[PDB]
């Protein structure tokens, strides 16, 4: 017994495909399944819907195969044998052998050749010979391939596909298969099972990889995502249900047979105008004998299939019978017009019964005419359904009013049928009876009722699944059923014992798979949603999962969360920042095993609060941060008529009847294209002049070489822009889909951003509110320092340090972008989502929508107009909904880029053209300046900010009393180092002596709380 | 319930949100506006109030000389919030109006399973028990086309309604950065 | 629990793999909304006793 | 062209209402657009389809 080692794939069809990850749903060999092994023995082996036959030998031993269904001297089977130079195929009838064999020449396996049909003599641990057979669809297909092997252990790794060789159009059955060689040579036999695969075609068109969909959960995630590598995260794979155990059927006792014979075998029948009706109730009727009782001339009945009539229960059977004249039968049907249909007997359109008719010439044929049967003639109005008219008085039809007489304008209402034995079948009589459709039930049984397992039921007429537990919802002494909110079927009353149960369907849920990533490892964990996994292990959750899934459905580690229960992960106590979310504050990660824990919000910190304590920084740092925002998306135009008709003159005219649904889509698609140019203009084109940086570079030690354009490259783009362009690359033709080019190129956006940079460097904030006025850069930095509350002499005394920090900060952005390939993620999602929407709109053109074919050429050139409009119209309905869905989703998605484009316009005006005083709008810390950069479909902002450091604690007081007066600071605070008092600014430590010019006086020192004593110079 | 309708739990529970709010309150009480830009620096509360008075153009001797009055006014002002929230139950009308709209859309989806668009019945176990296979496919195809339209209208309105909530969440995050982590000079 | 359904529904294309992707996107979005409002302080602070 | 923005709101809200009324004069794959000729030329059982 040896399992499969990834072997046994073939080419399902003769169609060439390259570089496509196609999916198939054909019979295949399940992966990792054991096969039988044989080696001087060769017994019988059943065929059983497929074979993976393979024999390995270094010498020519295997000769041929013989098949069959019964292996007798009567059965038809093949006699495939191999000659010295040719091959022989013969599927005929011959003589079988109890122990056939085949050592130079042996002839003891056959002695008959009678009734032979097909002959097809044609060309034909060291070597593997693997063959695959199958018999289906009135055909028998043979596939094979061979390859040398250098191994002495077993079948090697990898696989190679199989190709067709021949075909044999035959109709036969086969239930046995035995080989015949020349101690016996080894070989294997495996069977085939329906499955679903996913194969890969290389460039040349050869299958080199395939995966299953029911082996392990990771394979299911691969199938759902349609790829061969899955990244980190949690994915939703499939659903989950329970299967029932058995069925219960319960019918009333009722033991008596319906009076069918007295209705069908009545000697005397009434008239059509005075049809008699008979009521049937509380009986058991078998309709099988009803059809077989006699040969009826017409049984075509509506609403119920006659085969299923034996398994339905009704409330009443209103039978009625009458007699008409020959061809008048055609009026006995709903929606018909005629004398019988109008003035005699009307069938309502909601009729749900059956009609049975037959002739009997040898029952009512008298010579000279049978005048006992009469039928109504000209009347006033139309008879309502199921209404009988019994009046036979003379009716007046004319202007002259007559009273009780006849003659002119007054005639006897009825008329005598001319039933004569020599009359034609058109005027011959006819016998008909109509059945119109709990009391009447058919034959059945009654199995004892179960109480704790969810099973099928057929209580009275309702079919369904669910559990049956006792119900304590008191019923009134006459009710039968019960229904809860939203009209859901519920508690039912048992016909045998007066009892009320409950109905609740078997449990269902959803399955998700957590994967660390195939690049790292392979093991996975599985989560069942909103299910208390007390039923999963064995006896309940076995409907679609192979036994390999059992280890992932039960085991040693099972942990119950609020989102369900997790199988395959262990529970720890300590908590970290979490990576993969699950829900209810539980996350999972990889520790190399899978770890599930609780989230941690952050670290701990207790600020030392006191009545008279303060903290003031003594140093600072300069920081730079990034920010990415999208501005625009790709223009797309789709042609109306080309998509749904495809250059067919027989389709265009059938579309004009629908109206203006076709020209209302192009306008909507043009609106977005118009908007995604104003989006860019609002953001980048807001300076009216082009500025240039001076040739020399003396900016006080600051170095702007990494954001300014370079003259040693044709692109005229900054190195940061080069990296951004190379990181992200800037949906097929045919079928009337086009892409329009943007109005502004990239070499123009580069010019705009260079102009903005030159303006902010050489002028400041002046060029955005009038004419541009020049100013040296360190003076501008002094002005910007004064805007956050720090005096300007701080900058001038620490110029070199600030310049060095600025230069070092800008040199780490390149690394922080080129070392993290997941940084420009916001701009990749807009590109990815647009391609997915356009990829589905082209796959929807290969769908039938309920038609013979999905191509308009085959339908047209296989049929004529009057019955081709029905098939075409069913394709213009489904192909128009696919376009309506696409346009609506794009209108919503474009309202999200407009919101992001409008925000980017605010940032450029308030962060690049000025200094902002709001918080977190323009980065962390205190804002100093900002610089713009260009992206393929967006913008990038680099912010420069101010952050304190190196704090120290002092002692403070709100005021000072001296000579009976209270002294207050002008702009500062009062601090002490333990012996002396000073005055300093709030964002930087720089002590000074308290005097008059930095202090104002108001009031005496007997009101404020916390005043201290000191001296003022 | 049932019929393929599930509700998933949020990632953050209520306790964690309570901890976040408590941390923000502690930071704003014991440290001022400093912790929103760097390391937290302590400062006594009346001095923080004196700082905040300077931002609106009032000199700081006004606060110190009337501390016991501002304290009483602040304490009395908060105590009236409970008496106004407890009464007038229509105060939280912006939060009930979003719970109702979602639940009014799940009812119309389930209630539409009781329609029988141009067919014999509304339940699929009766057209499959009273009819032959070749005929019981025109009736089944009519029910499918109606249930797909009902499930398509539901998704479109959820997309439009979701875009409206994202606008409010983007506004609230601005008020937390600008009116809680610092002082604001914008009007209203 | 009806196979005639699953055999008849396949002919309409992919009109409920598109409906199961919009709702997941909506559900995922109502987690950045809560994170963008409350989670903006790194540490946890405690009021003095 | 000074008051361009406000004029486009009026025009868009009037083009849409015109298209809706004009769509009442299309067959959609039937014999006639008016209901009083469908009934007055066909009998009910197949006039309903
Ligand atoms: C203020 O911080 C700066 C850091 O930005 C300090 O400058 C560094 O000083 C160390 C000496 O201890 C040098 O090794 C570094 O090279 C300096 N940094 C740079 C960028 O040159 C500065 O000394 C600090 N000042 C005080 C008073 O502590
Ligand atoms: C607190 O600061 C005062 C500043 O006035 C320090 O007092 C001076 O300390 C220097 C250092 O020896 C002396 O030369 C001066 O004579 C002191 N007085 C003045 C008026 O400058 C004081 O030492 C500091 N206290 C501590 C603990 O460092
Ligand atoms: C009428 O009589 C015949 C006699 O052979 C019988 O076979 C048939 O079943 C009877 N009809 C009914 C409806 O039972
Ligand atoms: C048959 O009659 C008995 C008598 O009480 C009772 O069980 C019930 O009415 C009938 N059984 C059924 C309907 O299964
Ligand atoms: C400062 O606060 C502390 C804390 O209780 C206490 O000594 C007193 O309330 C205040 N002291 C002075 C001198 O104001
Ligand atoms: C600015 O930095 C770049 C990158 O290190 C360097 O090549 C250039 O020489 C610097 N500028 C000056 C004026 O040295
Ligand atoms: C300041 O000096 C006055 C005058 O003696 C005294 O009354 C007051 O208590 C002193 N204040 C402090 C804080 O020592």
UniProtKB/Swiss-Prot annotation, chain A:
Changing residue 860 to F: In strain: Omicron/BA.1. This is Spike glycoprotein. Changing residue 906 to I: In strain: Gamma/P.1. SUPFAM superfamilies: Coronavirus S2 glycoprotein, SARS receptor-binding domain-like. Changing residue 375 to F: Decreased HLA binding to NF9 epitope. Increased binding affinity to human ACE2. Changing residue 368 to S: In strain: Omicron/BA.1, Omicron/BA.2.75, Omicron/XBB.1.5, Omicron/EG.5.1. One of its GO terms (biological process) is symbiont-mediated suppression of host innate immune response. The gene is S. It comes from Severe acute respiratory syndrome coronavirus 2 (2019-nCoV). Changing residue 980 to Y: In strain: Theta/P.3.
